[PDB]
Amino acid sequence: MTGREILEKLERREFTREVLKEALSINDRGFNEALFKLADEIRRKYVGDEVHIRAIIEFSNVCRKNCLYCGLRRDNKNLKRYRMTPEEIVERARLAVQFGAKTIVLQSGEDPYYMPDVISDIVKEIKKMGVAVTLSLGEWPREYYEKWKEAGADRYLLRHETANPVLHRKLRPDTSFENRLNCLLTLKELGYETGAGSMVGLPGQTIDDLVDDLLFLKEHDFDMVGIGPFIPHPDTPLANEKKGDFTLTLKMVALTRILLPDSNIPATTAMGTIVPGGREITLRCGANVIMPNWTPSPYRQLYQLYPGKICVFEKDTACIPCVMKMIELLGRKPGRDWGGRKRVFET
Ligand SMILES: C[C@H](CCC(=O)NCCC[N+](C)(C)CCCS(=O)(=O)[O-])[C@H]1CC[C@H]2[C@@H]3[C@H](O)C[C@@H]4C[C@H](O)CC[C@]4(C)[C@H]3C[C@H](O)[C@]12C
Ligand SMILES: C[C@H](CCC(=O)NCCC[N+](C)(C)CCCS(=O)(=O)[O-])[C@H]1CC[C@H]2[C@@H]3[C@H](O)C[C@@H]4C[C@H](O)CC[C@]4(C)[C@H]3C[C@H](O)[C@]12C
Numbered sequence: 488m489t490g491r492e493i494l495e496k497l498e499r500r501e502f503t504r505e506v507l508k509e510a511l512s513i514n515d516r517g518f519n520e521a522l523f524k525l526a527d528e529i530r531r532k533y534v535g536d537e538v539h540i541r542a543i544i545e546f547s548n549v550c551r552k553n554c555l556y557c558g559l560r561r562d563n564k565n566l567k568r569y570r571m572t573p574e575e576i577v578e579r580a581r582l583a584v585q586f587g588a589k590t591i592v593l594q595s596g597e598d599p600y601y602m603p604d605v606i607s608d609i610v611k612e613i614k615k616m617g618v619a620v621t622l623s624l625g626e627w628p629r630e631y632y633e634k635w636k637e638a639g640a641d642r643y644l645l646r647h648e649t650a651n652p653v654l655h656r657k658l659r660p661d662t663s664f665e666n667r668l669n670c671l672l673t674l675k676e677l678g679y680e681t682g683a684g685s686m687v688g689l690p691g692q693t694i695d696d697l698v699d700d701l702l703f704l705k706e707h708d709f710d711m712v713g714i715g716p717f718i719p720h721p722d723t724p725l726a727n728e729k730k731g732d733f734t735l736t737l738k739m740v741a742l743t744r745i746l747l748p749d750s751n752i753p754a755t756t757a758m759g760t761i762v763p764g765g766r767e768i769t770l771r772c773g774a775n776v777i778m779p780n781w782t783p784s785p786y787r788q789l790y791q792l793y794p795g796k797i798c799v800f801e802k803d804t805a806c807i808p809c810v811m812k813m814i815e816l817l818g819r820k821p822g823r824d825w826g827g828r829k830r831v832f833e834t
């Protein structure tokens with residue numbers, strides 16, 4: 488199909504595998520810009536001009552897993568490990584609420600020390616502040632996810648990473664795509680707003696894999712989708728692999744918006760890392776959420792999922808005002824409420 492025919496089918500919501508594979512395989516600049524324009528317009532029509540701010544506190548870099556791409560993998564001995572205390576986490580969350588954050592995201596390595604009861608206590612304290620709480624702690628038993636929901640957690644971010652089960656198992660040797668999906672379905676059944684999403688440009692990943700990632704996200708109708716390029720980390724087995732391509736990752740964001748028009752889609756930190764200004768571009772091609780770093784020094788510099796992570800050298804209250812300025816220079820508006828998904832039911 489020509490690029491014009493693909494766009495026509497995308498505008499008519501004819502989301503066949505062939506259409507998605509062709510959209511990802513055409514590299515014509517005119518096609519790409521029309522695709523970005525379509526996703527930008529779909530975003531504006533369904534989710535409006537508000538860009539929702541989710542303040543992230545990366546509260547521990549301890550991890551029991553050994554994912555091949557991740558700088559926090561347990562075999563990396565070239566890393567100072569840290570754990571914030573529950574009081575530090577709660578008071579850091581309070582400072583973010585004082586700065587205007589309406590969602591607090593708690594993210595960590597899979598660190599058993601807090602699980603499940605310390606997390607529940609922290610969540611209860613933060614919920615007293617009248618904000619949304621999102622957890623991103625990895626794979627844990629249903630009993631833990633249930634305790635955290637009863638403590639008040641609203642959302643859970645568990646990126647599916649890759650929908651190809653063979654690749655998933657080789658990159659995440661402790662677990663499987665089957666377990667990852669089971670976790671996501673459990674999270675949805677418990678009432679969380681649930682976030683999935685993948686990396687783009689993983690070693691061995693093909694365009695057919697990316698199409699499957701899109702169809703996976705569409706199949707389960709996730710409330711949030713977090714997408715970013717793979718960035719190789721020197722202290723991992725993938726150190727010598729190529730980084731993911733920014734334009735291809737941006738096309739995945741755009742297609743995700745076109746497929747899931749009312750979903751919440753961040754312009755991820757990784758997008759800001761591989762290309763200067765990458766998050767701002769992504770907010771104009773389908774994304775509607777930004778997640779400023781609210782981890783305090785001296786820990787912020789130690790949460791090294793991939794190298795070059797932006798925000799590391801800024802003062803540690805800098806990132807919320809920075810994204811507020813970003814939203815204004817983009818001609819967008821701050822989110823007024825918690826920014827939960829607002830479903831538009833269609834046909
Ligand atoms: C800012 C630059 C270059 C200026 C430009 O191409 N803008 C057209 C008007 C030209 N001007 C009126 C400024 C000069 C005319 C008088 S003059 O005689 O001086 O030429 C333009 C050129 C291509 C544009 C992107 C693409 O679309 C894809 C995508 C569409 C989304 O929806 C919004 C995001 C995104 C990334 C766009 C952003 C931005 O928009 C770009 C970079
Ligand atoms: C934390 C300290 C001390 C006072 C305090 O503890 N203040 C709690 C405010 C709680 N809220 C944010 C919920 C109020 C929102 C009311 S509002 O009318 O905005 O809806 C206060 C004093 C001055 C406040 C900044 C400035 O003002 C400029 C700017 C306004 C933006 O907008 C939000 C970001 C920013 C940087 C502000 C952040 C923060 O707040 C500051 C630092």
Ligand SMILES: C[C@H]1O[C@@H](n2cnc3c(N)ncnc32)[C@H](O)[C@@H]1O
Nearest residue numbers: 556557646716717718719757792793
């Ligand atoms: C928290 C999210 O960080 C992403 N993540 C982890 N390691 C990398 C990397 N090297 N490059 C890009 N993204 C990564 C995963 O998608 C993970 O779920």
Ligand code: MET
Nearest residue numbers: 595596597623624625645
């Ligand atoms: C720090 S990676 C994100 C949180 C969790 N460890 C996961 O892999 O899903």
Ligand code: SF4
Nearest residue numbers: 550552554557560596
């Ligand atoms: S991706 Fe998450 S689970 Fe895997 S090593 Fe990194 S922190 Fe641990």
Ligand code: FES
Nearest residue numbers: 779780798806809
């Ligand atoms: S959030 Fe923008 S540079 Fe830190």
Ligand SMILES: [C-]#N
Nearest residue numbers: 753755756778
């Ligand atoms: C992540 N943003």
Ligand SMILES: [Fe+2]
Nearest residue numbers: 713755756778
């Ligand atoms: Fe993220």
Ligand SMILES: [S]
Nearest residue numbers: 798801805806
């Ligand atoms: S930042």
Ligand SMILES: [S]
Nearest residue numbers: 806809810813
């Ligand atoms: S920013």
